[PDB]
Amino acid sequence: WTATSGSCKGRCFELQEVGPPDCRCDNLCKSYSSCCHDFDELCLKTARGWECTKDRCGEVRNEENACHCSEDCLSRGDCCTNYQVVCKGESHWVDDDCEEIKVPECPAGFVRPPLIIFSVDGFRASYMKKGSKVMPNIEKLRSCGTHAPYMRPVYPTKTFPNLYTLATGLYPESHGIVGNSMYDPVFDASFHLRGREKFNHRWWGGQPLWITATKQGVRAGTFFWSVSIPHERRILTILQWLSLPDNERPSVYAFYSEQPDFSGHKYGPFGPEMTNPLREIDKTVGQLMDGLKQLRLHRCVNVIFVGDHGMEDVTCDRTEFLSNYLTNVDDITLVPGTLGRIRAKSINNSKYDPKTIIAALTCKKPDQHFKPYMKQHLPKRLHYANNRRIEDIHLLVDRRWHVARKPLDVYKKCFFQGDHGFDNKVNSMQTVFVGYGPTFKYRTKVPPFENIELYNVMCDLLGLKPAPNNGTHGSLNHLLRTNTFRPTMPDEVSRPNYPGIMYLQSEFDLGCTCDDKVENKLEELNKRLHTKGSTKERHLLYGRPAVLYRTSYDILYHTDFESGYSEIFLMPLWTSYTISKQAEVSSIPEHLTNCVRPDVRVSPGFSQNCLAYKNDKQMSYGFLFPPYLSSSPEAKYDAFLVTNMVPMYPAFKRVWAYFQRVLVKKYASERNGVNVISGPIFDYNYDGLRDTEDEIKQYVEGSSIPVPTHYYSIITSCLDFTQPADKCDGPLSVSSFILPHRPDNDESCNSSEDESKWVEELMKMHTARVRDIEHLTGLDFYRKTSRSYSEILTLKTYLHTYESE
Numbered sequence: 001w002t003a004t005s006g007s008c009k010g011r012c013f014e015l016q017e018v019g020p021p022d023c024r025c026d027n028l029c030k031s032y033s034s035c036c037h038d039f040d041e042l043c044l045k046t047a048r049g050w051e052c053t054k055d056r057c058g059e060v061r062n063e064e065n066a067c068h069c070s071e072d073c074l075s076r077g078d079c080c081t082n083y084q085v086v087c088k089g090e091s092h093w094v095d096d097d098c099e100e101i102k103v104p105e106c107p108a109g110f111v112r113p114p115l116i117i118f119s120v121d122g123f124r125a126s127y128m129k130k131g132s133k134v135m136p137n138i139e140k141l142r143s144c145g146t147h148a149p150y151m152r153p154v155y156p157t158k159t160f161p162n163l164y165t166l167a168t169g170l171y172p173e174s175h176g177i178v179g180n181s182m183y184d185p186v187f188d189a190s191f192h193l194r195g196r197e198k199f200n201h202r203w204w205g206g207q208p209l210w211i212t213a214t215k216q217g218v219r220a221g222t223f224f225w226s227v228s229i230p231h232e233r234r235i236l237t238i239l240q241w242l243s244l245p246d247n248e249r250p251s252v253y254a255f256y257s258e259q260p261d262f263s264g265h266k267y268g269p270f271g272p273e274m275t276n277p278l279r280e281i282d283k284t285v286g287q288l289m290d291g292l293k294q295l296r297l298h299r300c301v302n303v304i305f306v307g308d309h310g311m312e313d314v315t316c317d318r319t320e321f322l323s324n325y326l327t328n329v330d331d332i333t334l335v336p337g338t339l340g341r342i343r344a345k346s347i348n349n350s351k352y353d354p355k356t357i358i359a360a361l362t363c364k365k366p367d368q369h370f371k372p373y374m375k376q377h378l379p380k381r382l383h384y385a386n387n388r389r390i391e392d393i394h395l396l397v398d399r400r401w402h403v404a405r406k407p408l409d410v411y412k413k414c415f416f417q418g419d420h421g422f423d424n425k426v427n428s429m430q431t432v433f434v435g436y437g438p439t440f441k442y443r444t445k446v447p448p449f450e451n452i453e454l455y456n457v458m459c460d461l462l463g464l465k466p467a468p469n470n471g472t473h474g475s476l477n478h479l480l481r482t483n484t485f486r487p488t489m490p491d492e493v494s495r496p497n498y499p500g501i502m503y504l505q506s507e508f509d510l511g512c513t514c515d516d517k518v519e520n521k522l523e524e525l526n527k528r529l530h531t532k533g534s535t536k537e538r539h540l541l542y543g544r545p546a547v548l549y550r551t552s553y554d555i556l557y558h559t560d561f562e563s564g565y566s567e568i569f570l571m572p573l574w575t576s577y578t579i580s581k582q583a584e585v586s587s588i589p590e591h592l593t594n595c596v597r598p599d600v601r602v603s604p605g606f607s608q609n610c611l612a613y614k615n616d617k618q619m620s621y622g623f624l625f626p627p628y629l630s631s632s633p634e635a636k637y638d639a640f641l642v643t644n645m646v647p648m649y650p651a652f653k654r655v656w657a658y659f660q661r662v663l664v665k666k667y668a669s670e671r672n673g674v675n676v677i678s679g680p681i682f683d684y685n686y687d688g689l690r691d692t693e694d695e696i697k698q699y700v701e702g703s704s705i706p707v708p709t710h711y712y713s714i715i716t717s718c719l720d721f722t723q724p725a726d727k728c729d730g731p732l733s734v735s736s737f738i739l740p741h742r743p744d745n746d747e748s749c750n751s752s753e754d755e756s757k758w759v760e761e762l763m764k765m766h767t768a769r770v771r772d773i774e775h776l777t778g779l780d781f782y783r784k785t786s787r788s789y790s791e792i793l794t795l796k797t798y799l800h801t802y803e804s805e
């Protein structure tokens, strides 16, 4: 119930919410149907429109007008935004020369530069170039401020997940807004774009920026704008709040535009109808900037111009139907469109079987335009699994397509020509970032970065301590003139043991054999020196990784590689080696095919054994340092140490062997040497974080050898590829992956073919940031470089995406 008989007189766009059944005058009142009877009349004035004209200059104030051109409007704070231009011979902001803002130039009483977040829905990254002739205000912000060529959204590349990620710094799996439509089985409640459940606070997790600010004594404007409030009124409202007394005035504000997304859905990302929405958004930006200039705030406020996601060409004809794959289509509920999520229609149907649904959707038609996954098998870079609102069965839809349950859903719901929601590495899904103001840099281009990083920066801009989030605080310091955050490297928790030769060969009963009993003071000292670390500078280029949790591990040195060997997990946590451009690839000799050698530095009790692999009919083994890349036939023996062995399904060995035998050398030849760090990952609870031992669900049969869920590699070289990886004086270049350790290659529809036709495609899909691997291993890389720590943080957030320009 709402008693709508009170009044908004003096209360229009009041900042604090009053509680039912009292009548409201804030932004949300319309969305709850709770506004006072006179809200429209008093608070949504339109008379005479949004612009001063010459005849209005110096007019007698008429309070009915939407905005004012009377002499008293500046002190009231309610001039039309072009007042000074029309009536006082001032220039529009866009027509002024760019001039560096070296310090905040603010009115007296301003404690800090305000922040205005100007969010545009569906604003694809390439609009900045492609729409540049029609967006002069935006283009000035971009060229004079700090900009990225694009900003990476989160998956799914839909509005609510991305706006809430911008507000929180969290992945959707952690903030809980995992789609624009959701079912929460604990709640037994559904969230939709239409209707009321979406207003319930239980959907919205984490701590959004307005809460962070309010808790730390920094006031905030509303972020949500009711759809019926026109853009011109949202801008004037912001500008009126900026005229409040010091003790009442917010320091952080948001504007949202539903354009150009609304038109993009109708017309496609580049429809000729798109030029006008872009012009209209630019005009709105000009209204704000002229408005700020009238308030003497245009060299005071930090403005962020940001999108939520891009827009792709998608039409009704490019729809795949589950009814063409599944016999049982009426026993499922599909969340459809540019992604799929499947669950049982009834929890009382015990004949529902996810395994049979996955198989019925796997590589069934030659050009099939979606791929099914159990959510734990999705690329880890998506961070799209650890939430009960994400269904176990996921469908990754190809760009330009939709998935639906039955054809009738598509014609009983062509209209649309654009959509979005696809994998967040797809070029059409990328969006925009510009920062302009005293705290941002001047005329500066920065590399592309992820939207999860922005919360920390916005906190930095407001002097706030960010709530715990998925940004890497400091990785965006290069965007900022001041207010940088200067973190320390985390402390190493476990220090390594450095074992020498402590065991005789006969103490081992591992069931392993090797043909290695074949015999010099020149080369006896030389191999002692290699086992004590004499080539370590070559193979460990960035210091040893720090172990950030309590465990027991050993550093093992070898001619060709160095490793950190876990006594708990019976394998390396990491294996580091450098391959020069000149390196030669060799074979595993016939006589060494099945060779596994005990490591006399490590106890039998802390070693794997070959018998377990014999007895486990599903599990085989590989090696982390590849025997193919040995520096000499004698060094090759090191690669067959039991301490270099890891458990591998035969299907995965196809992948791994191709990576090690062909791709590593390819990379070294393309990048002028590479340093490779490889290792296992255990994430059985799909939380993105390193498992403890008691979380492992699978061991090599009859042993305590845990089976990884993934294998990673970090492949580092010199950004200036004229210098070799091992003698690089400047910035680094990295690519990484987190490959799923699967017992089949069902993910790869062409896996019956030679590995040259499918393995690299798989590896590209599972590209990763170093930071992703850090979370999954509890390791901290790049501890000893010549580079600044903020630069290294940026490097650790880099994602190699494999998309063209």
Ligand SMILES: *[C@@H]1O[C@H](CO)[C@@H](O[C@@H]2O[C@H](CO)[C@@H](O[C@@H]3O[C@H](CO[C@H]4O[C@H](CO)[C@@H](O)[C@H](O[C@H]5O[C@H](CO)[C@@H](O)[C@H](O)[C@@H]5O[C@H]5O[C@H](CO)[C@@H](O)[C@H](O)[C@@H]5O)[C@@H]4O)[C@@H](O)[C@H](O[C@H]4O[C@H](CO)[C@@H](O)[C@H](O)[C@@H]4O[C@H]4O[C@H](CO)[C@@H](O)[C@H](O)[C@@H]4O)[C@@H]3O)[C@H](O)[C@H]2NC(C)=O)[C@H](O)[C@H]1NC(C)=O
Pocket: 170, 171, 173, 174, 175, 176, 202, 203, 204, 205, 206, 383, 386, 387, 388, 468, 469, 470, 687, 688, 689, 775
């Ligand atoms: C991305 O950044 C985020 C933020 O830093 C990282 O997420 C954090 O990771 C921590 C580890 O997973 C996690 O810490 C746990 O928190 C429990 C308390 O949680 C509540 O309070 C916090 C603080 O205010 C709040 O934020 C939480 O919000 C979550 O839950 C509500 C729903 O209730 C949602 O609205 C909200 O969206 C959010 O959901 C997300 O997180 C939860 C997990 O908290 C997931 O289940 C959801 O799917 C969703 O992702 C909560 O309201 C605390 O109780 C935990 O402590 C247990 O574990 C420790 C191990 O140290 C153990 O020693 C303790 O004994 C304890 O165990 C007991 O509980 C077990 C489970 O019931 C039980 O099995 C045992 O036997 C014991 O009884 C733990 O500290 C932290 O909450 C989240 N925060 C957020 C916001 O998500 C994230 O990891 C980053 N991602 C990557 C890839 O780096």
Ligand SMILES: Cc1cc(COc2n[nH]c3c2CCN(C(=O)c2ccc(S(N)(=O)=O)c(F)c2F)CC3)c(C(C)(C)C)cc1Cl
Pocket: 117, 118, 119, 121, 122, 158, 159, 160, 163, 164, 166, 167, 180, 193, 223, 224, 225, 226, 227, 254, 255, 256, 258, 261
């Ligand atoms: C800067 C900022 C602003 C906001 C305010 O955002 C909104 N204010 N007003 C509307 C919104 C977005 C959703 N609405 C839509 O019209 C809509 C459009 C497209 C698609 S689609 N089809 O493009 O996915 C959808 F789904 C939609 F719902 C309703 C209008 C937020 C929060 C978190 C408060 C939302 C966080 C931040 Cl950092």
Ligand SMILES: [Ca+2]
Pocket: 121, 122, 158, 159, 160, 261, 308, 309
């Ligand atoms: Ca959107």
Ligand SMILES: [Ca+2]
Pocket: 682, 683, 684, 685, 686, 687, 688, 689, 690, 691
């Ligand atoms: Ca885990």
Ligand SMILES: [Cl-]
Pocket: 156, 158, 178, 179, 180, 181, 335
């Ligand atoms: Cl969705």
Ligand SMILES: [K+]
Pocket: 613, 614, 615, 616, 617, 618, 619, 620
């Ligand atoms: K086996």
Ligand code: NA
Pocket: 745, 746, 747, 748, 749, 750, 751, 752
């Ligand atoms: Na296959």
Ligand SMILES: [Zn+2]
Pocket: 122, 261, 262, 265, 420
């Ligand atoms: Zn949209």
